[PDB]
Amino acid sequence: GDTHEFHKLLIKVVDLFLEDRIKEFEMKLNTTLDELEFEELIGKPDSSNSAENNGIFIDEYSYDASENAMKKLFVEYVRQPEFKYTVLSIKGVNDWVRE
Amino acid sequence: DTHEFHKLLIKVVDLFLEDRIKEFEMKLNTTLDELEFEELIGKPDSSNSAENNGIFIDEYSYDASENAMKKLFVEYVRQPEFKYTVLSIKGVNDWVRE
Ligand SMILES: [Ca+2]
Ligand SMILES: [Ca+2]
Numbered sequence A: 001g002d003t004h005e006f007h008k009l010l011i012k013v014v015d016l017f018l019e020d021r022i023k024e025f026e027m028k029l030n031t032t033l034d035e036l037e038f039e040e041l042i043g044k045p046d047s048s049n050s051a052e053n054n055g056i057f058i059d060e061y062s063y064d065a066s067e068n069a070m071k072k073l074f075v076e077y078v079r080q081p082e083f084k085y086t087v088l089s090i091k092g093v094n095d096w097v098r099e
Numbered sequence B: 001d002t003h004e005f006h007k008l009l010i011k012v013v014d015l016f017l018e019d020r021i022k023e024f025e026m027k028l029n030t031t032l033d034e035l036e037f038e039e040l041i042g043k044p045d046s047s048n049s050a051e052n053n054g055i056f057i058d059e060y061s062y063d064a065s066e067n068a069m070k071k072l073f074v075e076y077v078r079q080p081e082f083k084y085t086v087l088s089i090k091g092v093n094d095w096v097r098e
């Protein structure tokens, strides 16, 4: 029932998704991450796009997975004061891409 | 590893039933043993099971209130030795009234 353990699990979900143990996923959520946790969640993407709509950001992070395979992570969030991020959704998608 | 991975899937369902994860889906290809599959689903108030072309979808209901419930869908292929290849897990919120 712990919030830290909860954020650690979310980070692990993303890790497992990038490993392709979780092939694809989506989760609806309402939890507030410290910058350190948010950075841990997203890692080092090869590409990113960030779009703001009505006070909410949806970022799309792309990770080169394998030769034609790409992993894409969408994180929907609200930016809070003291550099906190209220995450509302996370979605992981596979895509075939030209090498 | 795989035992740790299966422990996480079980905990994802747990967090979903607690409503920390409001709703979710995961696409998967992993084989749970009988004990893991039992622990994953926990203690539903009712269950439904359907089969189409050798693929099973079980639907589990967990009552929250008079009107609200959590539903878990698990799609899987039964394997020898009481093992189950899970292909997707989906947690949704449902209500009695429109
Ligand atoms: Ca990571
Ligand atoms: Ca190729």
Ligand SMILES: [Ca+2]
Pocket: A098, A099
């Ligand atoms: Ca190229």
Ligand SMILES: [Ca+2]
Pocket: B098
């Ligand atoms: Ca309605």
